[PDB]
Amino acid sequence: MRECISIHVGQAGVQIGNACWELYCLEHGIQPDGQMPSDKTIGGGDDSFNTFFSETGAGKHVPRAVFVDLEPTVVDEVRTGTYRQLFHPEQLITGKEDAANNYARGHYTIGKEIVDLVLDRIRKLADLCTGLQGFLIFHSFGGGTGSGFASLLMERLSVDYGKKSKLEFAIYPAPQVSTAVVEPYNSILTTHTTLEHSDCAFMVDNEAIYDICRRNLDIERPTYTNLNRLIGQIVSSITASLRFDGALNVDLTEFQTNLVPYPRIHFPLATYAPVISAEKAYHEQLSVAEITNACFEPANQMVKCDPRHGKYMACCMLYRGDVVPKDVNAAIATIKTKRTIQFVDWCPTGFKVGINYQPPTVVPGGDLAKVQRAVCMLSNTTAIAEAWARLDHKFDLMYAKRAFVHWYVGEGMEEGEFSEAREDLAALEKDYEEVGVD
Amino acid sequence: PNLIQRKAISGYAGFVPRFAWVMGMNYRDGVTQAMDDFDKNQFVFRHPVCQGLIPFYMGFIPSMQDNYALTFGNSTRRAYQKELDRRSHTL
Amino acid sequence: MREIVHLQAGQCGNQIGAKFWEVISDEHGIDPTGTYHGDSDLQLERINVYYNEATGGKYVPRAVLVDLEPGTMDSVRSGPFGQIFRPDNFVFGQSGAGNNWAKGHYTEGAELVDSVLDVVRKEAESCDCLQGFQLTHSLGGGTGSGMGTLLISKIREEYPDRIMNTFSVVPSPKVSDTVVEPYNATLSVHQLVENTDETYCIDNEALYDICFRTLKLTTPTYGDLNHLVSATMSGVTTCLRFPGQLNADLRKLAVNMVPFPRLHFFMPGFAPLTSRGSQQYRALTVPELTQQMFDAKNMMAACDPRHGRYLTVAAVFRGRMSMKEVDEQMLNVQNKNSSYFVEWIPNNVKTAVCDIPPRGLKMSATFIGNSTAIQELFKRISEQFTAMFRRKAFLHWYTGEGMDEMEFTEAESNMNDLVSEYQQYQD
Amino acid sequence: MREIVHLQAGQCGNQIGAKFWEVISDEHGIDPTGTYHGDSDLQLERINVYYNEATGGKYVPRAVLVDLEPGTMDSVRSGPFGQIFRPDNFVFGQSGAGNNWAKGHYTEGAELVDSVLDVVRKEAESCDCLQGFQLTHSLGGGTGSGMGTLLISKIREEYPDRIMNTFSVVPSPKVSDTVVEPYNATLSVHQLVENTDETYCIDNEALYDICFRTLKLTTPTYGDLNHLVSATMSGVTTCLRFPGQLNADLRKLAVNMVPFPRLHFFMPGFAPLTSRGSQQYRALTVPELTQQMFDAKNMMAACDPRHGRYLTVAAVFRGRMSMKEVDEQMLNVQNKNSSYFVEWIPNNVKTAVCDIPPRGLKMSATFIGNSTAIQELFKRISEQFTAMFRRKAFLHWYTGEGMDEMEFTEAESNMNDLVSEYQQYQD
Amino acid sequence: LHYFLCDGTVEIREVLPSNSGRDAMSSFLRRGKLPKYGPPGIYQPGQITDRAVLNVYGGLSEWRADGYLLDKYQLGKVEQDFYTDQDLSIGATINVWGRK
Numbered sequence A: 001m002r003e004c005i006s007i008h009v010g011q012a013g014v015q016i017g018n019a020c021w022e023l024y025c026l027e028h029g030i031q032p033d034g035q036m037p038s039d040k041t042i043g044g045g046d047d048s049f050n051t052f053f054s055e056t057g058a059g060k061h062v063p064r065a066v067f068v069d070l071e072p073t074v075v076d077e078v079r080t081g082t083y084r085q086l087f088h089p090e091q092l093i094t095g096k097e098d099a100a101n102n103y104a105r106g107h108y109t110i111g112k113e114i115v116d117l118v119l120d121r122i123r124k125l126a127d128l129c130t131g132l133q134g135f136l137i138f139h140s141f142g143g144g145t146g147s148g149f150a151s152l153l154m155e156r157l158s159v160d161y162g163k164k165s166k167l168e169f170a171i172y173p174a175p176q177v178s179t180a181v182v183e184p185y186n187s188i189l190t191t192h193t194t195l196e197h198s199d200c201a202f203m204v205d206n207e208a209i210y211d212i213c214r215r216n217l218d219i220e221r222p223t224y225t226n227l228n229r230l231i232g233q234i235v236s237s238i239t240a241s242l243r244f245d246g247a248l249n250v251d252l253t254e255f256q257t258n259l260v261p262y263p264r265i266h267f268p269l270a271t272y273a274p275v276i277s278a279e280k281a282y283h284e285q286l287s288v289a290e291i292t293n294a295c296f297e298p299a300n301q302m303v304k305c306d307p308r309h310g311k312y313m314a315c316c317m318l319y320r321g322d323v324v325p326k327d328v329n330a331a332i333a334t335i336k337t338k339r340t341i342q343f344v345d346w347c348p349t350g351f352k353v354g355i356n357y358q359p360p361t362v363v364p365g366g367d368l369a370k371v372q373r374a375v376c377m378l379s380n381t382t383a384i385a386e387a388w389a390r391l392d393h394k395f396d397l398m399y400a401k402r403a404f405v406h407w408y409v410g411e412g413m414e415e416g417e418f419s420e421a422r423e424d425l426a427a428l429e430k431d432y433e434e435v436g437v438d
Numbered sequence B: 001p002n003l004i005q006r007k008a009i010s011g012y013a014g015f016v017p018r019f020a021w022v023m024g025m026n027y028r029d030g031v032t033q034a035m036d037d038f039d040k041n042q043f044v045f046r047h048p049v050c051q052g053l054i055p056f057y058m059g060f061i062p063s064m065q066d067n068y069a070l071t072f073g074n075s076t077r078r079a080y081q082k083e084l085d086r087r088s089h090t091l
Numbered sequence C, D: 001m002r003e004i005v006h007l008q009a010g011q012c013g014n015q016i017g018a019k020f021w022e023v024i025s026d027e028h029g030i031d032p033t034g035t036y037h038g039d040s041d042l043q044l045e046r047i048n049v050y051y052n053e054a055t056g057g058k059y060v061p062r063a064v065l066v067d068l069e070p071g072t073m074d075s076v077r078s079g080p081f082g083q084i085f086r087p088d089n090f091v092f093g094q095s096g097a098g099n100n101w102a103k104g105h106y107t108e109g110a111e112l113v114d115s116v117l118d119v120v121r122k123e124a125e126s127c128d129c130l131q132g133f134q135l136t137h138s139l140g141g142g143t144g145s146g147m148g149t150l151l152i153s154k155i156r157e158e159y160p161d162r163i164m165n166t167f168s169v170v171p172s173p174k175v176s177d178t179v180v181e182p183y184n185a186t187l188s189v190h191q192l193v194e195n196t197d198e199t200y201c202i203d204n205e206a207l208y209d210i211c212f213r214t215l216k217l218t219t220p221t222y223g224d225l226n227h228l229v230s231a232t233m234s235g236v237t238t239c240l241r242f243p244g245q246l247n248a249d250l251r252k253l254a255v256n257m258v259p260f261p262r263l264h265f266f267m268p269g270f271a272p273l274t275s276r277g278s279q280q281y282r283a284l285t286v287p288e289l290t291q292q293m294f295d296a297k298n299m300m301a302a303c304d305p306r307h308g309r310y311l312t313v314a315a316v317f318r319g320r321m322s323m324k325e326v327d328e329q330m331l332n333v334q335n336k337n338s339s340y341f342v343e344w345i346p347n348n349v350k351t352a353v354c355d356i357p358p359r360g361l362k363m364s365a366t367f368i369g370n371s372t373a374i375q376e377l378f379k380r381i382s383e384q385f386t387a388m389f390r391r392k393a394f395l396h397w398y399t400g401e402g403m404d405e406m407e408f409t410e411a412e413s414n415m416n417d418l419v420s421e422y423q424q425y426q427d
Numbered sequence E: 001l002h003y004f005l006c007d008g009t010v011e012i013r014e015v016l017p018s019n020s021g022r023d024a025m026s027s028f029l030r031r032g033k034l035p036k037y038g039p040p041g042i043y044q045p046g047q048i049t050d051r052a053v054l055n056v057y058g059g060l061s062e063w064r065a066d067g068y069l070l071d072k073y074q075l076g077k078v079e080q081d082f083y084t085d086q087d088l089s090i091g092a093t094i095n096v097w098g099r100k
């Protein structure tokens, strides 16, 4: 039917997978024991919940996700957590050794012995699934593990499955923070190994994730609990159409078709507009015009790329909750009439809209609000070339000073690839200004 | 502590006590009784500060062959009780 | 799984290992009897990193202890946990050291190496997969250096893919006791630079300055000195054990830490050492930790890198924090002293965050830095070496052993090479 | 039923059997007076394979004891279990030994062979279906060899279809006490090689090595040493008398064990030896049992098997095991040192697994292995033989008693043939 | 044992018999002071002494090994009882780092 396969590749992946599945159990009320209250839902697993769970004749929902890790500690703790007996035992594949922040160590010396097992899990899910619409791959760019292994996995899964779609969600380098000196290396490695098979990859910046918290949510000391909750509700908004009903519907396939103009560039930015606390929600008014102004306001975007430094190119907005289309189209009219947002001249029309009736969901004791109207925006721009421009002016320095290269050559890597990665990246920037110029 | 204090998660990359003493059996029962008597003895540990054997058996129980003139069955059960009586040296 | 087997050599190493082991036992609640103390399932969950399992609910340590004179081992055995150590593993030597590095390298080592290798390989067979080995010793004193050189030079080839961490006490600058100490240090560091991968340096004068300036107690012992240095090792080590999101691998810190093969030597230093009244006169906040943390007075390593410059730093914090405090602290310090860092590579701090604070304290930390601050130390050792070799003072002993001045020549060449190298990248 | 009759020869065999029989008695739990207390139905079941039973619940042993000098027999009968022997079974002669194989094989034997044969065949009539006989004696010991050669030669033909176990002690490399010992050993081995099938060889030098290394008890006694040596054959016999998914027959081991007709020589090997506090300070697991078992030090028979190559190895484990661990350990050793073995016969290992452990230990092993390690023994004996023959020193006794030097010639020829023949198999 | 009266400390030696199968080391324990009860959670060496200094004005210059100003309230004096001569008799209970 309709379903997606979840691939949490990464130590940072299990973070967000744990959080987003904590969300995913609430909206259908999946008890941490595995079965519903007195009310009846069990059967072949035929309702909206099938698209994630297989609550087969055993009556227990199956998490259609696979968790891969390279340090036993965090996976061990999460299975010593609460939702353990909900999880499947050997969907939690954990190694015994670390990539040592080294993309090459992750890629060559360590990657080989696990790919067989991981493909085994994927195919023994693929046999029982029907639609095979897509995967949700989550890794981390600066992943001291998650960096490399994910890339080679993408390689082999693309070559053995050449038809279906791939959505990547990866926390990005920070502009002024690199908590790993190896981050500016593995970033270029992963980029020039993944641009050519990754279907659509999305990024976001942790620093601005922090900033928004005390810009509007008023959180001086947030944590991962908060951050992961945010990203989880992001993906919940994006798959709301997949799960629930509404007036008109769209799918990840439509996202792929509409959003990405050219090969290469498929890197839009996402913003969730109605992030605000309960005190604001209670005696403060919510409506379409102000939420749209919030979404297109530059600062609220969690990536330090001023849109005025660039030009909006494509735009997809999904509205969720009790909303009507009149104000929606009037708002898009006011938006297009405003001049400051200088659109690329190519497409006169650049707006894909998707409406779902079902309101979003809070978690008790959480941080979000008892919302009625919500909008998620994902739009692709040209205002982002500055980030990789920033990456190069330091990668050049460090490779010219050949610092740490002893590490990679000792583990068994050479440098022709390190050379060609920079031309791949230069190609992406030059294509960016080429497409920007009209 | 550890809830589901009966089995902590099949495929425990972390290790468990009672790999020794009583092991050679599977995860669940071993780990749960491990932790159970483990914690119990720790607590104390932290207390104050101050009829009818069938024929053709091989294996000699006392006497037997000296006495005779019956069937294997009756004779053997006879010895079965009298090994509580006079050749009571069996245990 | 992955685990650690410890090496303690020299009488310094004996004392250090004794304190270090007893502090770890205090951490996981082990008593002098040897049974477990169940209070923290989390303190139980990972004992394989340091303790093998024995029968009867007992936890032998995987420690190889070596010395030459029986009195040191008898003192250690008569301490609070000699029963926790093993008698079988108590290998020792038939003669005295003589505080002569040639003796330590060719005369008796030539027939102790066999037994020590047998013991260590038996332990390795017992265990499955190693991070590697850390060795605690002295580079200046006789026994520690004399056997450390040989043991690393051996173990390296038979285990070519492990972490060879060397944790050594550095001889006193102005009063080093041993008068052949310059010679010993030179002939030891010569092989050390070629064999090890990562090195921790500590000086007892800086220990004295700490124990006076901030401890404020006027009558400590070398035991208290060992306690502080053991605190440093506990902070660097326990990361492997406990949960929470942070890099733990020693190789991880290495690949974050060392830019070039000859880069080896680092400078420890702790988080709040608290006087008699400042426990209740102090509020524990991330800003004040960072304040006292990256402080000149607080450094315990050799002497102020104020002359030198910082290549890289690594910080491991411990407690119930979040990310943005360490983020803002590092952002601030970068610009608070921009000029003291090397412009070669930015983002020069590697940061780790653990959730399990020590037994009796809420917010703690540990620092380690690679700074261009060893030039002065081995420069001083260079003048002493040149002055003493100038007229072949005390040369008769080592010649009688069978040494030669040629090895002195290439040793001084190598040390000067390191001097120039550490000069070049920084300046 | 199947049963085994014990033969005690030579004054060593005296003390050896004296310890061995009380070992059996207490491993079955019987008082000195003989009134067995049933504490284990299984041991009660299988006690038959050695014992016969009178009335009154006293377990007579089926062991024939023979000597010449009466005092040692008086001592053993006065000992703690003298009542358990049969004064019926004691036979001797009036005359002395001279520690002289000439007298033993021609003079003093001709008037005791009759009575010893009579008693042994009477007990043979008493028993039903033998596997065979085992003889405890010495090869360098005088009277033991003197009687043993004859008695083996006389039982071989009468019972040509059974198992002739021989148990003997080898002269010390450094000093053999007896000085006509090499002549005696050569003369005895001449008949042993032709007649026997199986022979264990033991030596006090490596026994003393064991005592220093692991007994660690300062002042030992030869009785406890006999305990140490007796545990071995007790163990190899243990399976005969207890259940479990394994097999026991001395033939069931010999067929595995002997690759060619001229092979009879076997070096015992024993498992966990426990020191001062290692009782509490060791972890008993199949891994460490395997490691400690297959060791150069733990071997005690002849010489370090470091120098040659192995041919066949057999191990029997006693406790509550499974097949996985033994199989994987065998693979571990085989692959680790594939070179030490001989490539002629691959899969050169055998493993038996019995459920009922020895008393006091929950897990034990016993090792026997026939390797190309026996060279040095008959080498040494050969050079000593020729050297002492160079001037025929100590020969008037033997020529007077009435042999000729031609028997010496052929004995040395056969021994040289054995030398070359093992050398040809090995290389 | 051998209880000193000039130090308030204790020493332990061993009387193992011959052939006991035990090491030759005699002085089983040090001559420090036995805590009255079980192994105290190590009271973080760094604050384990007797006096209480207030401030040090020395490192300003160098005339002596700096000054040690005293105090008058002695805060942080923490309770560590020790096995004195009082609780001694034939027949009692004494814990020695876990030794009943």
Ligand SMILES: Nc1nc2c(ncn2[C@@H]2O[C@H](COP(=O)(O)OP(=O)(O)OP(=O)(O)O)[C@@H](O)[C@H]2O)c(=O)[nH]1
Residues within 6 Å of the ligand: A010, A011, A012, A013, A015, A016, A071, A099, A101, A140, A142, A143, A144, A145, A146, A147, A171, A179, A224, C245, C246, C247, C248
């Ligand atoms: N996704 C996620 N990222 C985090 C979290 N906390 C910090 N991060 C960021 O995510 C990244 C984690 O990736 P890596 O450091 O490479 O992790 P790794 O190679 O798998 O190994 P570990 O560091 O041991 O977890 C870090 O660079 C952090 O910047 C979190 O809870 N979730």
Ligand SMILES: Nc1nc2c(ncn2[C@@H]2O[C@H](COP(=O)(O)OP(=O)(O)OP(=O)(O)O)[C@@H](O)[C@H]2O)c(=O)[nH]1
Residues within 6 Å of the ligand: C009, C010, C011, C012, C013, C014, C015, C097, C099, C137, C138, C140, C141, C142, C143, C144, C145, C146, C169, C171, C178, C222
């Ligand atoms: N145990 C102990 N060691 C100390 C103390 N102070 C300094 N040390 C160090 O211990 C070192 C020697 O330790 P070892 O290596 O075991 O002894 P060694 O090899 O014989 O070297 P020598 O000092 O010449 O005797 C010295 O170089 C000192 O630097 C102390 O107070 N107690």
Ligand SMILES: Nc1nc2c(ncn2[C@@H]2O[C@H](COP(=O)(O)OP(=O)(O)OP(=O)(O)O)[C@@H](O)[C@H]2O)c(=O)[nH]1
Residues within 6 Å of the ligand: D009, D010, D011, D012, D013, D014, D015, D016, D097, D098, D099, D100, D137, D138, D140, D141, D142, D143, D144, D145, D146, D177, D178, D222
């Ligand atoms: N009973 C006993 N025999 C020992 C001991 N040590 C070595 N043996 C040897 O074991 C040998 C076998 O004993 P017998 O065959 O009875 O001795 P023998 O035939 O009278 O002649 P000799 O060997 O010269 O004494 C002895 O000869 C000794 O050489 C010991 O401690 N006790």
